[PDB]
């Protein structure tokens, strides 16, 4: 009745979702085969298993998610893995051939055959539930499947549903390193059909998560399973107030209105505070007044940016565990006085706090310790504009003499989308630049 729904598009969407749904079944009691843990019996009321699961007649909790991807390979690994009994096989749908890093295949010629089936699958998920509150789009900006097919899922869902909120999670193409070559093409063309068709889009860089694992954790050599656990920790803490009792719960509905000022600036960053290895957790005194001080500092960010060069508009802080409401209030008091960190001068409050009573649990195999307290920061920052400007420059290097274009335009694709995306992206930068100064 206070539930949400998620759809994962692309290989990154389902591989992150593999790490998320491990944590969702450890927070709530549900065993890997979609069952209550036996023995230990939580009873009837206790309605925390609703935001991400659906209860059948027996104790078979089925997750409220459809995993669509055009490749079979990663979906079949999920379907033959340790969670084959959890996901309903009609939710584990798959395509035929991938879009293969091609936006045209993900939107026009290969993405149009599953689009009827994925909307039918979301509609009966939406019909079965009654209290819909938001959508959780898990994908990546890099590939052609995960960014091209979600463009349909951002637009068809907006036309069919409309007023209901819908949240987006994505993987930013990395600033210094990159995975593939055609990534700057797939990154900005989706923004034309993402800007006016979304409410907020949490943007995450994987290269900064590498830097987190190197320094904040003691683990050099990170595997993708270790990277997506941090994203699973973030997506659990945004939706922690929708399922769990807290002193100051925040609903997903008022989460938008206290984060996004304007209907076009809807790109917040992410920050998880207590990313500490178990040994160093045995050492450090960890407290509220310094754990959100670690949120603001540039070396604990999730996207390559700079808080010292970028001014925040609105900050949404979400706490967990043994938090007490002055401990945030003393922490906001001591950080308003910090002359290193700058806000924009027309927003004097600039803060939303979120208080939750139950501390996070740690999945076995990870590096985090069982810390009784956690902070998730979700901040709109002007410094995302300079992360956009480098990606616009990466696109202009290829597009100067029109390279890697015949793969696109041969598959039912035009060149007007290339032209219009430049001043569309220029409209992003001029909207993010006009808030940089205050009127005296």
């Amino acid at each position: 009745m206070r539930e949400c729904i998620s759809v994962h598009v692309g290989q990154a969407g389902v591989q992150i979702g593999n790490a998320c749904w491990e944590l969702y079944c450890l927070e709530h009691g549900i065993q890997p085969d979609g069952q209550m843990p036996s023995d230990k019996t939580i009873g009837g009321g206790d309605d925390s298993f609703n935001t991400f699961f659906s209860e059948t007649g027996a104790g078979k909790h089925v997750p409220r998610a459809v995993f669509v991807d055009l490749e079979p390979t990663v979906i079949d690994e999920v379907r033959t893995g340790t969670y084959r009994q959890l996901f309903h096989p009609e939710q584990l749908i798959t395509g035929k051939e991938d879009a293969a890093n091609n936006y045209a295949r993900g939107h026009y010629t290969i993405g149009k055959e599953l689009i009827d089936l994925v909307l039918d699958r979301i509609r009966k998920l939406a019909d079965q539930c009654t209290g819909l509150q938001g959508f959780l789009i898990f994908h990546s900006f890099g590939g052609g499947t995960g960014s091209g097919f979600t463009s349909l899922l951002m637009e068809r869902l907006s036309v069919d549903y409309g007023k209901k909120s819908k949240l987006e999670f994505s993987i930013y193409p990395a600033p210094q390193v990159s995975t593939a070559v055609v990534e700057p093409y797939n990154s900005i063309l989706t923004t034309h059909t993402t800007l006016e068709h979304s409410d907020c889009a949490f943007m995450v860089d994987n290269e900064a998560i590498y830097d987190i694992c190197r320094r904040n954790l003691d683990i050099e050599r990170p595997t993708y399973t270790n990277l997506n656990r941090l994203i699973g920790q973030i997506v659990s803490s945004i939706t922690a107030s929708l399922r769990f009792d807290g002193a100051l719960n925040v609903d997903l509905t008022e989460f938008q209105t206290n984060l996004v000022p304007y209907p076009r600036i809807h790109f917040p960053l992410a920050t998880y505070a207590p990313v500490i290895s178990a040994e160093k957790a045995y050492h450090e005194q960890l407290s509220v007044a310094e754990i959100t001080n670690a949120c603001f500092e540039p070396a604990n960010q999730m996207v390559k940016c700079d808080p010292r060069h970028g001014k925040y508009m609105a900050c949404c802080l979400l706490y967990r565990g043994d938090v007490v409401p002055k401990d945030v209030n003393a922490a906001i008091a001591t950080i308003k006085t910090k002359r290193t960190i700058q806000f924009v001068d027309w927003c004097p409050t600039g803060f939303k706090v979120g208080i939750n009573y139950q501390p996070p649990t740690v999945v076995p195999g990870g590096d985090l310790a069982k810390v009784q307290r956690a902070v998730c920061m979700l901040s709109n920052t002007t410094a995302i504009a300079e992360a956009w400007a480098r990606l616009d420059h990466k696109f202009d290097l290829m597009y100067a003499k029109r390279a890697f274009v015949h793969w696109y335009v041969g598959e039912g694709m035009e060149e007007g989308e290339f032209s219009e995306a430049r001043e569309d992206m220029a409209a992003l930068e001029k909207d993010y630049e006009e808030v940089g100064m205050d009127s005296v």
Partner: peptide, 26 residues
């Protein structure tokens, strides 16, 4: 075995009347 089509389905499969539950002895 080989993952082509419907192999989901292959691998996965390889005394009361209304009176006696409402009108019981009081």
């Amino acid at each position: 075995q080989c993952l082509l089509y419907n192999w989901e389905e292959e691998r996965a499969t390889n005394s009361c009347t209304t009176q006696k539950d409402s009108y019981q002895p009081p």
